[PDB]
Amino acid sequence: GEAPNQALLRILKETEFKKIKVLGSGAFGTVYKGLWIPEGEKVKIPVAIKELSPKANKEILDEAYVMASVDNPHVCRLLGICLTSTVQLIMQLMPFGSLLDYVREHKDNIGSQYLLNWCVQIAKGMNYLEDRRLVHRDLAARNVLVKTPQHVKITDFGLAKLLGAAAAEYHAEGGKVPIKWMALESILHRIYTHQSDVWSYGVTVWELMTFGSKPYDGIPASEISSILEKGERLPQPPICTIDVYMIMVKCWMIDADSRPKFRELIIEFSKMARDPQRYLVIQGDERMHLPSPTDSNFYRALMDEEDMDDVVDADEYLIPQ
Numbered sequence: 152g153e154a155p156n157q158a159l160l161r162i163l164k165e166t167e168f169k170k171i172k173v174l175g176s177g178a179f180g181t182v183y184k185g186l187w188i189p190e191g192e193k194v195k196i197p198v199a200i201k202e203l204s205p206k207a208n209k210e211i212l213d214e215a216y217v218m219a220s221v222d223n224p225h226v227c228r229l230l231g232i233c234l235t236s237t238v239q240l241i242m243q244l245m246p247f248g249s250l251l252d253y254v255r256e257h258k259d260n261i262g263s264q265y266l267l268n269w270c271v272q273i274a275k276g277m278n279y280l281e282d283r284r285l286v287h288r289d290l291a292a293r294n295v296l297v298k299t300p301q302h303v304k305i306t307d308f309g310l311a312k313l314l315g316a317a318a319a320e321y322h323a324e325g326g327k328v329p330i331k332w333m334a335l336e337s338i339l340h341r342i343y344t345h346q347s348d349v350w351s352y353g354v355t356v357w358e359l360m361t362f363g364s365k366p367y368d369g370i371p372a373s374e375i376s377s378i379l380e381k382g383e384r385l386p387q388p389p390i391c392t393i394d395v396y397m398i399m400v401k402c403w404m405i406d407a408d409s410r411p412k413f414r415e416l417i418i419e420f421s422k423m424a425r426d427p428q429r430y431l432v433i434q435g436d437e438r439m440h441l442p443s444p445t446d447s448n449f450y451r452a453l454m455d456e457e458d459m460d461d462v463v464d465a466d467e468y469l470i471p472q
C-alpha cells in the first residue's frame with residue numbers, strides 16, 4: 152500500500168478501433184462491442200468499449216486507474232483509454248457475456264465440473280485483488296464475464312477502492328450499492344473489507360448453484376438488513392450437498408473474521424472440483440457439454456467481419472506502445 156504504482160496508462164486513438172454493436176446499456180452507461188486495429192501491427196483485437204460531463208470523466212478515470220493496476224488471468228484487462236469528449240474505457244471482449252446470463256441460458260447443459268471450476272477461478276481473482284489491497288465492493292454473477300466456458304474473469308471496478316497503507320477498511324459515504332450482495336456490516340455501517348467481499352462471493356456462488364436465481368426474490372432491499380439480522384440466509388440450492396452449502400453459510404457469518412479467506416476458498420473448491428459429482432447433484436451430469444469455438448469462423452459472426460485471419464485475443468497482445 153506504499154509502493155509506487157508504475158503501471159502504464161495507455162492512450163488509444165479513436166481512429167484505430169470501430170464500434171460494431173451495443174452489448175448493453177444501463178446505470179453503468181453503454182458498452183459496445185468493437186474491433187481494435189493498432190495501425191502498423193497486422194492485428195485485430197476484439198474489444199469492449201465503455202462510456203459513462205465533468206463528473207462522468209472523473210469516475211471513468213478512477214476505474215481506469217484501478218483496471219490499469221491489475222494483471223491477473225481471472226481479472227479483466229484494461230487495454231487503454233480513449234480521450235474523446237467523454238472518456239472511453241477499452242477492455243478485452245469477453246465473447247460469452249456475463250456468467251449470470253450464461254448459467255441462465257445454458258442451465259440444462261451446465262455440469263458440476265464447470266460450476267465448481269468457476270468458483271475456483273472467481274476466488275483466484277478475488278484473492279489476487281486482496282493481494283493488491285483492492286476491495287471490489289460489487290462482486291456478483293453479473294460482474295463475472297465469460298471468455299470461454301472454462302475461463303471467467305471479474306469486471307466492473309466502478310465501486311472498487313484501494314485500501315491505503317495502514318487502512319484495514321473502506322468507509323463509504325452514501326452511494327447506491329446492491330443490498331442483496333452486501334455483507335451486513337456494509338449495510339448497517341457502510342464498512343467494506345476483503346471479508347465483506349467474501350460475503351458477496353457466497354451470494355455469487357449461490358447465484359451459480361441456482362443457475363441464476365435472484366437472491367431474496369420478491370423481497371424489497373428495504374427488508375434485507377432486517378432479515379439477515381434475525382439470522383435468516385439464502386436457502387440451500389437443490390443441487391448443493393451440505394458440503395457446498397456449508398461453505399456458503401460460512402461466507403455469511405456475522406463475525407467477518409469467521410468467514411473464509413479467498414485463499415481457503417480456492418483450496419476447498421479445487422478439492423471438490425476433483426470429485427464434482429460428490430458435491431453437486433445434477434441430473435444428466437455425465438452427459439453434458441458446453442461449446443467454446445475458438446475457430447476463426449466464430450469471430451467472423453461475432454464481429455460481423457468477413458476477414459478475421461489476423462484476429463488476436465487481448466490475452467495474446469502484450470505489445471506496448
Ligand SMILES: COc1cc(N2CCC(N3CCN(C)CC3)CC2)ccc1Nc1ncc(Cl)c(Nc2ccccc2P(C)(C)=O)n1
Pocket residue numbers: 174175176179182184199201242243244245246247248249252256293294296306307
Ligand atoms: C459478446 O460479448 C458480450 C455480449 C453480451 N450480451 C450478449 C449475451 C446476453 N444475452 C442475454 C440474453 N440473451 C438471451 C442471450 C445472451 C446479453 C448481453 C454481454 C457482454 C459481452 N462481453 C463483454 N466483454 C467485456 C466487457 Cl467490459 C463487457 N461489459 C458489459 C457489457 C454489457 C453489459 C454490461 C457490461 P459490464 C459487467 C457493466 O462491464 N462485456
